[PDB]
mmCIF file with all atom_site columns, C-alpha atoms in Angstrom:
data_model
loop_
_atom_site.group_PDB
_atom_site.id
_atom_site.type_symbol
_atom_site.label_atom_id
_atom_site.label_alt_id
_atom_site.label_comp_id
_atom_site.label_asym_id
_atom_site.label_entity_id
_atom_site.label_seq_id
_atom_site.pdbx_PDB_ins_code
_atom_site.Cartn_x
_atom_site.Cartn_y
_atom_site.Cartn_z
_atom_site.occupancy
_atom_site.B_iso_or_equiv
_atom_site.pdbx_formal_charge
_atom_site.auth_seq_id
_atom_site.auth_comp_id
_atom_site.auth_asym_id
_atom_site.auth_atom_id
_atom_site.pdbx_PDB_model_num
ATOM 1   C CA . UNK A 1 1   ? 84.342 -46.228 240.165 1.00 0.00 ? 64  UNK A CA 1
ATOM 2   C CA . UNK A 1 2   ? 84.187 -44.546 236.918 1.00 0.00 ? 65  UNK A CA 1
ATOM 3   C CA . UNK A 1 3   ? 84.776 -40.980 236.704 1.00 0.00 ? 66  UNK A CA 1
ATOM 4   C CA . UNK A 1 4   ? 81.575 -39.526 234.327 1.00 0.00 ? 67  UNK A CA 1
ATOM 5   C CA . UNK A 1 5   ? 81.739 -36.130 233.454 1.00 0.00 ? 68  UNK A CA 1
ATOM 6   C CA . UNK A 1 6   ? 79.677 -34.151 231.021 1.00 0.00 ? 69  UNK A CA 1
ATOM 7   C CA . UNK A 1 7   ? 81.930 -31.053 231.230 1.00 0.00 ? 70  UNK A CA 1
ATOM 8   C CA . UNK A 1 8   ? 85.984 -31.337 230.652 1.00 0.00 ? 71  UNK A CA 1
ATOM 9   C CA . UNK A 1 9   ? 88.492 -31.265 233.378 1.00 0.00 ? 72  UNK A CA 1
ATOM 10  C CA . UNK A 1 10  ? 89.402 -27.404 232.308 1.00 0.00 ? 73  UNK A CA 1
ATOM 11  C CA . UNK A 1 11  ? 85.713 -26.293 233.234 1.00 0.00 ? 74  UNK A CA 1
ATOM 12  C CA . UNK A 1 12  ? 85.265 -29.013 236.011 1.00 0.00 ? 75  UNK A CA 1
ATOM 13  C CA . UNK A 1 13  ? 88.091 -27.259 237.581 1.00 0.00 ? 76  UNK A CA 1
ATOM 14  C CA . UNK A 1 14  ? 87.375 -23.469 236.390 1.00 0.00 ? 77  UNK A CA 1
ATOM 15  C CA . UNK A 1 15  ? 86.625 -20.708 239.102 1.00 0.00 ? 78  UNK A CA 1
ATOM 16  C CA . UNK A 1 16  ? 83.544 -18.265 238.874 1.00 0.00 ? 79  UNK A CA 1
ATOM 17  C CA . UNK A 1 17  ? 82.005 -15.407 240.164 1.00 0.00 ? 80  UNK A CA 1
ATOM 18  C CA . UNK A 1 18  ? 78.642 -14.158 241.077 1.00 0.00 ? 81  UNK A CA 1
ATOM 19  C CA . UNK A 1 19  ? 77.523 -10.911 239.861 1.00 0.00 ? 82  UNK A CA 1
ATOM 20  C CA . UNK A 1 20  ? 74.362 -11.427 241.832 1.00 0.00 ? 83  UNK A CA 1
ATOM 21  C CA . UNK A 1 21  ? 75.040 -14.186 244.648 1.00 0.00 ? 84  UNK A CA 1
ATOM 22  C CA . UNK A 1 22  ? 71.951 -16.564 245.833 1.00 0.00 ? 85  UNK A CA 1
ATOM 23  C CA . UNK A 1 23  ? 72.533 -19.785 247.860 1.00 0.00 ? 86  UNK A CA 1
ATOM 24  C CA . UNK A 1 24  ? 70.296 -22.007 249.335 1.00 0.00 ? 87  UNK A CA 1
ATOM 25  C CA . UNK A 1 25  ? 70.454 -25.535 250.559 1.00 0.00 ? 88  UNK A CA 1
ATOM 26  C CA . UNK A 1 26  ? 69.062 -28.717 249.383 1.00 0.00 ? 89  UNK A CA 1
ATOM 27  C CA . UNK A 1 27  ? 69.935 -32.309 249.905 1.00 0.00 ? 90  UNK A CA 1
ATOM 28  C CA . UNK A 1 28  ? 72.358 -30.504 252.283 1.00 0.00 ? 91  UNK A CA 1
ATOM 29  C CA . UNK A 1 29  ? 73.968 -29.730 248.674 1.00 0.00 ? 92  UNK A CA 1
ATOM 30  C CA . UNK A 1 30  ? 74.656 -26.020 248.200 1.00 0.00 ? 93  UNK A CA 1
ATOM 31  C CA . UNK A 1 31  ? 73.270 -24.635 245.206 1.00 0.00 ? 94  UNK A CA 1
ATOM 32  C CA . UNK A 1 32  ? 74.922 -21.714 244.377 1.00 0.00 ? 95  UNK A CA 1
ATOM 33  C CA . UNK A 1 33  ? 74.312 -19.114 241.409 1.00 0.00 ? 96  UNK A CA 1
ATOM 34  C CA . UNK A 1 34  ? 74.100 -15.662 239.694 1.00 0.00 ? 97  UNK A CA 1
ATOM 35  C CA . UNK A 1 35  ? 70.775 -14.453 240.422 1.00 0.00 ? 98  UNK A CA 1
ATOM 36  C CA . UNK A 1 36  ? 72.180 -11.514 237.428 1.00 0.00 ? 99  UNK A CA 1
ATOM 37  C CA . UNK A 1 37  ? 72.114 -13.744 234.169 1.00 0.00 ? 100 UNK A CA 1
ATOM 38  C CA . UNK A 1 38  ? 68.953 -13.791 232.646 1.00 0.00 ? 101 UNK A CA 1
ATOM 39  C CA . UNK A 1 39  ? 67.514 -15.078 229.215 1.00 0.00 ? 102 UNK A CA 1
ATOM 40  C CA . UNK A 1 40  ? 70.376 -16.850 228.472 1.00 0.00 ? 103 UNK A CA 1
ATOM 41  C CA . UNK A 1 41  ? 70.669 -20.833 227.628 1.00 0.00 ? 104 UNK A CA 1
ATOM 42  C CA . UNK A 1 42  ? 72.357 -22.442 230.307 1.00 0.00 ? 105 UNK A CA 1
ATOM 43  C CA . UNK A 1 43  ? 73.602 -26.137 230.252 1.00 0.00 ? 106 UNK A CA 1
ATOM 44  C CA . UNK A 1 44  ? 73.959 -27.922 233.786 1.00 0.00 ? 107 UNK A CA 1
ATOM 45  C CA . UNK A 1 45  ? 77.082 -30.369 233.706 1.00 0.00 ? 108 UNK A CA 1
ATOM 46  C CA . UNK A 1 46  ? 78.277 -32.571 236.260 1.00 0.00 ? 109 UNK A CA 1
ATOM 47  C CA . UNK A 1 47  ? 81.191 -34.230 237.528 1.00 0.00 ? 110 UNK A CA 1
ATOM 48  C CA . UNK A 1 48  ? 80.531 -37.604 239.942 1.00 0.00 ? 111 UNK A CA 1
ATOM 49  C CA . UNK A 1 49  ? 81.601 -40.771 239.962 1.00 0.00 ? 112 UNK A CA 1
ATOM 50  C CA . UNK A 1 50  ? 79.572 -43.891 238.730 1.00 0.00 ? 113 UNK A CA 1
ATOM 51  C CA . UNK A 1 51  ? 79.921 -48.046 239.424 1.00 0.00 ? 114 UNK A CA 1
ATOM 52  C CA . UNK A 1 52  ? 79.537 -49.082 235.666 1.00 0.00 ? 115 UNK A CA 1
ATOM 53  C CA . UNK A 1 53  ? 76.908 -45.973 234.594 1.00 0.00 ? 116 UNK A CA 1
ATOM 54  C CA . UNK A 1 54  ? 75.023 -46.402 238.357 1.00 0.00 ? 117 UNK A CA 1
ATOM 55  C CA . UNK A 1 55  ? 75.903 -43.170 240.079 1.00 0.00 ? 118 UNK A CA 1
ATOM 56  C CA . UNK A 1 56  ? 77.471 -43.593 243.059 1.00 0.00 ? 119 UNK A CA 1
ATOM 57  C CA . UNK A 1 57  ? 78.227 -39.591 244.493 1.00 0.00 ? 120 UNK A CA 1
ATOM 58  C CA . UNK A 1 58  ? 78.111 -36.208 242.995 1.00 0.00 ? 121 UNK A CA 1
ATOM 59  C CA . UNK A 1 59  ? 81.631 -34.866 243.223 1.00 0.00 ? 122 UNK A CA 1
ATOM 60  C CA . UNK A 1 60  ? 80.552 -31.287 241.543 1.00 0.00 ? 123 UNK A CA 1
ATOM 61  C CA . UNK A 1 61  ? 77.865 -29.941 239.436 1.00 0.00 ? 124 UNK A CA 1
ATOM 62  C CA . UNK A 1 62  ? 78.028 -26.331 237.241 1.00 0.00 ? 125 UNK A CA 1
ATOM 63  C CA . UNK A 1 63  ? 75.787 -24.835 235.122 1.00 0.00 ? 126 UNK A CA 1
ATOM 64  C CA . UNK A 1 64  ? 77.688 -22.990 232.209 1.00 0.00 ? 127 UNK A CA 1
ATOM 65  C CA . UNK A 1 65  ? 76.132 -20.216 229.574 1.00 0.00 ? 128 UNK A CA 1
ATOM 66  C CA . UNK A 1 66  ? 75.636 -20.254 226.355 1.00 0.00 ? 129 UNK A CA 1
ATOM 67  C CA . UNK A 1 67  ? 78.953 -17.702 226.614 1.00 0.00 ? 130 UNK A CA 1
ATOM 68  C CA . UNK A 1 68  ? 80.913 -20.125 228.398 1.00 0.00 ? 131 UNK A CA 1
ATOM 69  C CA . UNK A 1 69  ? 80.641 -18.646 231.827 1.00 0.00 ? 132 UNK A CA 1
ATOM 70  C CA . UNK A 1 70  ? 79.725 -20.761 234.711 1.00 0.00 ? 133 UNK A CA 1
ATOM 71  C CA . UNK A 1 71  ? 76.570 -19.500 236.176 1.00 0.00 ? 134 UNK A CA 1
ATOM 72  C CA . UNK A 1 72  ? 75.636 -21.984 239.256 1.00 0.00 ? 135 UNK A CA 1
ATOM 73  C CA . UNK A 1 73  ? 77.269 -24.933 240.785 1.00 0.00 ? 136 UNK A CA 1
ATOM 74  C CA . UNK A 1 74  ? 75.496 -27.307 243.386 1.00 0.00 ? 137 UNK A CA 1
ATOM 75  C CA . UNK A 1 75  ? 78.098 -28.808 245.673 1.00 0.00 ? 138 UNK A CA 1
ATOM 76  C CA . UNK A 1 76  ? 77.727 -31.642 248.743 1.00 0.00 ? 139 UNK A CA 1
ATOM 77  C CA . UNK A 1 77  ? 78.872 -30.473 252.251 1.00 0.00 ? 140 UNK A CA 1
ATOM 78  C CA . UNK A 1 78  ? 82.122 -32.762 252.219 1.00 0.00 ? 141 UNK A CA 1
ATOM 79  C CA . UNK A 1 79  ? 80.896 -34.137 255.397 1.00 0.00 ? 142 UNK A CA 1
ATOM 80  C CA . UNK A 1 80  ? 77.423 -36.343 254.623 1.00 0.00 ? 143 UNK A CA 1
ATOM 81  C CA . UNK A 1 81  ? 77.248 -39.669 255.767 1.00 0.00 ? 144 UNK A CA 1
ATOM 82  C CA . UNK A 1 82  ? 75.408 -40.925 252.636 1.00 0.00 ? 145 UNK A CA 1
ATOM 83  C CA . UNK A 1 83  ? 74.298 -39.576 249.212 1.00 0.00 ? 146 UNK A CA 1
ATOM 84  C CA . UNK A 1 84  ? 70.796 -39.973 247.563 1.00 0.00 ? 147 UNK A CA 1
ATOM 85  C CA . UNK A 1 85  ? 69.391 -39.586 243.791 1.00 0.00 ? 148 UNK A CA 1
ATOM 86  C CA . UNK A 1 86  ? 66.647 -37.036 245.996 1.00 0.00 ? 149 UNK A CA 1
ATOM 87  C CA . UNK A 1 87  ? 69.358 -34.882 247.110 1.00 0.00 ? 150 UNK A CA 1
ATOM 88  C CA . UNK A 1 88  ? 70.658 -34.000 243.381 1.00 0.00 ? 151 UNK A CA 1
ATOM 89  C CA . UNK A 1 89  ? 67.102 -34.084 242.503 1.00 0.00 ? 152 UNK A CA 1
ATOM 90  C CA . UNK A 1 90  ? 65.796 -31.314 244.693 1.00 0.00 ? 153 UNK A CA 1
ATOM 91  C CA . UNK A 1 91  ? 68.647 -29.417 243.925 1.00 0.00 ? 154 UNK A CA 1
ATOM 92  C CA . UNK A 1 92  ? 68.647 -29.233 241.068 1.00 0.00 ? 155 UNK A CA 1
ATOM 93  C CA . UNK A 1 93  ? 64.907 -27.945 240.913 1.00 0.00 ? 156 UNK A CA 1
ATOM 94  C CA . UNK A 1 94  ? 66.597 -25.138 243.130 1.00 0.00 ? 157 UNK A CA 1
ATOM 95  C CA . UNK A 1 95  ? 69.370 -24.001 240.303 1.00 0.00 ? 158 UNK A CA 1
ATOM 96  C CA . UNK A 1 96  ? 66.830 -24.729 237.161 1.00 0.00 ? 159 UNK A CA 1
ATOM 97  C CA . UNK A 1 97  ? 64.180 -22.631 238.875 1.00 0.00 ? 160 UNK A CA 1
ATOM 98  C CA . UNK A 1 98  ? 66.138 -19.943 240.015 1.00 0.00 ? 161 UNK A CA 1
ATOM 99  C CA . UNK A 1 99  ? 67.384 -19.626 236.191 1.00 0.00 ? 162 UNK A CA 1
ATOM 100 C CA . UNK A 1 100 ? 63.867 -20.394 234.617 1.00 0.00 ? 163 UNK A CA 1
ATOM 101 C CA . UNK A 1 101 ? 62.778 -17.201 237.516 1.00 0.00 ? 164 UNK A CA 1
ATOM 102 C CA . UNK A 1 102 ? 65.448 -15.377 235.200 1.00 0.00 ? 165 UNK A CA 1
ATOM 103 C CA . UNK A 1 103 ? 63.623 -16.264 232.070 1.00 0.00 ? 166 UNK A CA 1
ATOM 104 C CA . UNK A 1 104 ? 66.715 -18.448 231.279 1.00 0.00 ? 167 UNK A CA 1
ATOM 105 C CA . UNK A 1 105 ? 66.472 -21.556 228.659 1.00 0.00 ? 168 UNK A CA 1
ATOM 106 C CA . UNK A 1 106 ? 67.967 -24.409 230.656 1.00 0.00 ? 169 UNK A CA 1
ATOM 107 C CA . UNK A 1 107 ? 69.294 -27.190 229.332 1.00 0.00 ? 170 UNK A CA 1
ATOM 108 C CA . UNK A 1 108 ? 70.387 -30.986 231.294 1.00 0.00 ? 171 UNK A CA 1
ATOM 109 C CA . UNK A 1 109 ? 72.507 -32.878 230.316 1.00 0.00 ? 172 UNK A CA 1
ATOM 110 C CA . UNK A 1 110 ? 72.188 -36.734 229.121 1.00 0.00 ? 173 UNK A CA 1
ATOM 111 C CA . UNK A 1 111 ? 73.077 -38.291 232.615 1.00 0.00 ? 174 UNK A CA 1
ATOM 112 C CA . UNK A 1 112 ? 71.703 -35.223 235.199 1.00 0.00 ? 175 UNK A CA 1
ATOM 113 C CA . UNK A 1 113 ? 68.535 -35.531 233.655 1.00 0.00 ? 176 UNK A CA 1
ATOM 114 C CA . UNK A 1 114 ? 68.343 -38.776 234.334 1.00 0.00 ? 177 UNK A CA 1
ATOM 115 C CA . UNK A 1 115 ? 69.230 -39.305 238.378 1.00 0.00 ? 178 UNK A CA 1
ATOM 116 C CA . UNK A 1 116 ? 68.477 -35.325 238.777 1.00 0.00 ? 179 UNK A CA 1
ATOM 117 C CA . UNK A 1 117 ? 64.917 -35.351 237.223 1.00 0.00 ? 180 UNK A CA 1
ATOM 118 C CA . UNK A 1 118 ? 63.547 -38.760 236.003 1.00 0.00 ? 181 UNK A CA 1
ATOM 119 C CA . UNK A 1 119 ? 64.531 -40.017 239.291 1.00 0.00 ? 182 UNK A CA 1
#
């Protein structure tokens, strides 16, 4: 598999904080995020693998601000015995409406938007 990434390996890898924390559990993915930040753009940016553009597992999603900081992340339990386009999906409706809540401009990017919300 491909490794597809729409953030670099600095900010795939970069450690955050939660002025406000908020979970909650989708796809048995945990979405995680700063219930705090409001009205800012956010972009969400993944990290998964893919078998020639297909996706074949999220590996880590984040959604940075405008400012740089990350914001949210959804991550899979390590543990699932499979991995479906709905899981990402519904998540992702968890972290984009907890930030649109928070009056926040949010932003997908070109392959999320595709197996996270066409799909």
């Amino acid at each position: 598999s491909r490794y597809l990434t729409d953030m670099t390996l600095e900010e795939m890898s970069r450690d955050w904080f939660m002025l406000m924390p908020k979970q909650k559990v989708a796809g048995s993915l945990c979405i995680r995020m700063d219930q705090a930040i409001m009205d800012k753009n956010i972009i969400l940016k993944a990290n998964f693998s893919v078998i020639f553009d297909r996706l074949e597992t999220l590996i880590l999603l984040r959604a940075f601000t405008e400012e740089g900081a990350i914001v949210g992340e959804i991550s899979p339990l390590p543990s699932l015995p499979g991995h479906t386009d709905e899981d990402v999906k519904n998540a992702v409706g968890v972290l984009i409406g907890g930030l649109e809540r928070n009056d926040n401009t949010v932003r997908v990017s070109e392959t999320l938007q595709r197996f996270a919300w066409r799909s």
